[model samples]
Every structure is written in C-alpha cells, then in structure tokens.
Target: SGADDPNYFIGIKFRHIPYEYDVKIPHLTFGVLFISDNMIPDVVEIMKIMKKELFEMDITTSYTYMLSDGIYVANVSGVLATYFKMYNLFYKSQITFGQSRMFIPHITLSFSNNKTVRIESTRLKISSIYLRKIKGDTVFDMSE
Candidate 1:
C-alpha cells in the first residue's frame, strides 16, 4: 500500500515478473553506474576529464506498447546512442551490469498490463545533464 503512494517511484521494472508499483517522470537516464562510497574521488577525477557537447534532437515513440519479454515498454528512439557510447567509453568501470549496452531510451509508464493513450513524437533540448542522486524512492537530489 505504501509503495503505491504517489511519492514512491519505481526506477526499474522486470518483465514477466509481477510488480506492485508504477510511476512516471519527465526525464531520461543516460546510464546507470555503481560506485562505492569511497569512489567519490574517482568520480571527481573523471568529471574533470569530461567534456560537453551541444545536442538537439527528436525522440520519437513509434509505438506505445512493447511486449518484449512481457514488458510493456514504450518504444523510444533518439540520439542517445552517441551520448551513451561516449559515456561508457569514458567511464567503463563505473558502468552497472543491468545498464543497456546500446541505448534504448524509453519512459516506462506502468508495471501492469494496462493500455496506454497514444503519444506523439517528442523533441528534447540538451544543454546540461544533471547528475541526480536518488535521495529516496520519490525524492531526487539534482543539485549535483
């Protein structure tokens, strides 16, 4: 019951596995990484070496219901390939196991087998990518 509260967010969901939470957000995840608490120094070092680029692109959803592995995911496509390629190459050791090798950017809207309202293509503007920390289930610390 508490997990279904509006303040509780689910970051990931497994297909063919029933889950009890569903939430939506208005952003995207470039990559997921795992670093020990002591690894802040390493992150800082890597951050110093990182550079920025200008990217403006369109992210399209050709379909709303994707039934892969019984997972109902929205089909998404965009320029994430270029960005994630650079991210993984620059920070290989920090990359997590469940993160996708190729970018298949999508906004998961639900965990159950519910239908979705049709969605139009969306455009995104990229300037600064904020590094957010999941303070809790629903709260995020984006000050970084």
Candidate 2:
C-alpha cells in the first residue's frame, strides 16, 4: 500500500458484453472511475462488498439507451447495486474542475461522431474490473 504511482482508469471493461467484434473499439468501459493510483483500494473495497451482496445476480441486461454529451451509452442494471456502495464510500462535498459528484452508471458504447452498433443489449455480466494505468498504458484485472 506504500507504492507511489500515477493515476488510473478504473472500470469494468465490456469484454463480457454481447457485441459485434468485427467493428469493436478497444478499451471501452462501463461505469468508468478515474482515480489516483493510491485510490485503487477504495474500488477494491467496493468489489468485495459486491462479491457477497451482488455477485450472485451479476448478470444484467441493457434496458435503454442515452446520449451522454454526444457519446452513446447503453445503461444497464448491473450498477443498480453498484453506484450506491461506491458513492457512500467516495462521496465528498467539494469542487475542482466542474466535475459532478453525482455519478451515473452506464456502459459507454461509442465516442464522438461514431455511430453505435445495434445489439439486443442483453446478457452482459459484471465479471471483473480493471485498473488501467495512465502512464504505462496497461491494465491490471480485478476480480473476486
């Protein structure tokens, strides 16, 4: 826990989601949380809680779609039990770069200008998450 490292992109990569692989974009994630390297443990703590309380019903399906600032996102039920736990632990009243503390959970399917692919949006699973290093451009998998 005494390690010093750069920030990371914490997210559940959409490897388990049902999508077309031919036109796939790499590194797309669900409920992305960008935090300092030392902050990895907080997300890890949430994972343990999710393991006991939420893992049994980890499989979720997309119910609807929304455009988040021109980026298409497929909102799912996987985070129905996720966001609150993480929020309770990470929430603080403060402001820096105009980022909202209010977190909305969704699967980012497409970035700017790219049209999203059509899918049944069914049969997605919360199998694991990753801590993607910003500096090294590598990912460390987190699974219970």
Candidate 3:
C-alpha cells in the first residue's frame, strides 16, 4: 500500500531506458523525476474549500510533495506518511492523514541518484527525465 492521493497527485513524464545487467536484489524498483502538480480533481476541490479559509491558493500543495524514492511494489504507505511527518516541521501543521494507508505504493529513484557513487552501480535506477505539466486528472504516460 502506497499513497493514494485522490486529489492533486502529479507526476513527471519520463522515458525508461532499461539497462541489461545482473544483480540479485530483494525487489525491482524504478525511479521517478516529478516536476509539477497533476491536479487530482476531487482532492483539488476539497482543498479549494479549505483554501478559502486557510490561505489564498491551495492547502495540499502547501505541505504536499512528490518524492524520488526507489520503487517498491509493496506496502509503502507507511513510508510516504513518514515523509509527510518529516516535512511537517516546516509547516507547523500536523496532518493526521499521513498515517493513513496508501492504496498504491510504487516509486522509482530520482534520475539524480546516478550522480552519486553509492548509487552508480545499483539495481534501482532511473535513466532519463522530462518535466511535463498535467492539465487535469489523468494517469501520466511517459511514452507520449
């Protein structure tokens, strides 16, 4: 279980260039390079209502983030919530939802991971990245 952001879930467009290699790893995971907001409709609507009272534009974007963790097809919801908690220090707002279960849990490492020697020779890899703005609610397709 990973994070299921029913609203304002955004992703970046990427082209996967799979490399042929050999490595005995626990699980195969991909990396991601998130660029901007995807605007999940329902979540955006709810935040609209809250924003009217909270601030000017939106609330979710205030403390929300798309991380570049290595992909894990299992229950990663806990990890996501942990990320929220980690950044909670900046907002001064404690969102209880971070502790909630995620409906989907899959993330790839960032393209920048390869920049470091530690990740240079690892199974978890991300080769290329492209920033794309999502106009509405829809699954982002990298091939396009």
Candidate 4:
C-alpha cells in the first residue's frame, strides 16, 4: 500500500547520477508536507526564512530506529517537536491549511520483510531545507 509513490521518500534523486550516489550515505528526513504542483511564491525568501528559523538549532545528534510493521523509522521525539514548531511558525499557512496532523520525522530505509539491523548512531548538520519538485520518479532539488 505504501510503495507505489516515491514522494513519500525524500532523498537525493539526480537525473544524470546513478543509483549508487547515496548508497553508502544516509539521508535524514525532517518532516513531510504534501503539495502537488503548487507554485511556491518567493521560494528563495522562504529558504531564507528557514535558514533564519533553523539557525540556532543544533540538529547534530545520534538517532536510533525501531522496527515498526516493516519500516525502519527513526525515533526523533526530542527534535521533531521543535522542528515542527518552527515549521508551523514560519511556513504553516503557506504550505499547509487548517490544523495539520502531528509531524513524524523518519527516514524510510526499505520496504518488505527484511530483518532489522542496527543503524549506527550518526550526526547531521542541517544548514538548509530543500524544496524538491518531483516528476514521476525523478526528484529535483528546488532549494538552492
């Protein structure tokens, strides 16, 4: 039921690059905001806003994953809340409408009946937020 679309998965998807681009590296998923082909006005200004809002945040921390139903979901309770608060404060009305659901920060590893493996604790530095435009399976980074 979940593997049909790829927008649910947010990682680097360059057109000319091979699949092995991020095979060894891990990409962290912050939060999900589903907007289909909606033109975002002042995207650069939005990026600036994100940069300012996230400037003081220390996103460098160790993350652990728990197996839930078949997904390796990162348990990020400590950081997700604050991040979402920032999202709501700055870009909520612009990107979302009315009251939105709780934000769950997780990086989807794979789908299927795969055995659970320990994801070694890693650190991340969030300097910028990417605004991606996806066409079919191709993902273009719209935040630069």
> Where in model 4 is the C-alpha error above 4 Å?
1-25, 36-38, 42-44, 60-63, 77-82, 90-92, 97-103, 112-122, 133-144
The number of residue pairs in model 3 that clash at the backbone is 9
Per-residue alpha-carbon lDDT of model 4 for 25-140, expressed as tens digits?
33445544444345244433444565554444444333434445655443432454556664664354465311234435554444333444443444444433454443334233
lDDT of each: 0.42, 0.49, 0.26, 0.41
lDDT of 2 by residue, 1-144 (tens): 222232454456544656423325333343344555565666566556555554344545544344556565655665555555554544441111112343355556555434455546476655666656544554556555
Q: lDDT for model 1, on a 0 to 1 scale? A: 0.42
- Per-residue lDDT tens digits for candidate 1, residues 39-125, read 545544544344332133344554556445444556556746555554664457553322344435555545557565464554434
Candidate 1: worst-modelled 10 consecutive residues by lDDT: 1-10
Candidate 2 residues lying further than 4 Å off, grouped into runs, are 1-9, 20-38, 52-54, 57-59, 63-66, 92-103, 112-121, 133-140
The residue ranges of model 1 lying beyond 4 angstroms of the native Cα positions read 1-24, 41-57, 66-71, 92-103, 116-120, 125-128, 132-144
> By the lDDT metric, which is better: model 1 or model 4?
1
TM-score pick, better of 3 and 4 = 4
Clash pairs (backbone) in predicted model 2:
none
Return the TM-score for each candidate structure: 0.48, 0.55, 0.23, 0.51
Which residue pairs show collisions in model 3?
Answer: 1-75, 2-102, 2-104, 2-105, 8-40, 30-108, 31-108, 31-109, 71-107
Each model's RMSD to truth, in Å? 9.8, 6.5, 13.4, 7.1
Clashes of each: 0, 0, 9, 0
Residue 48 accuracy (lDDT) in model 1: 38
On the 0 to 100 scale, the lDDT of residue 123 in model 3 is 24
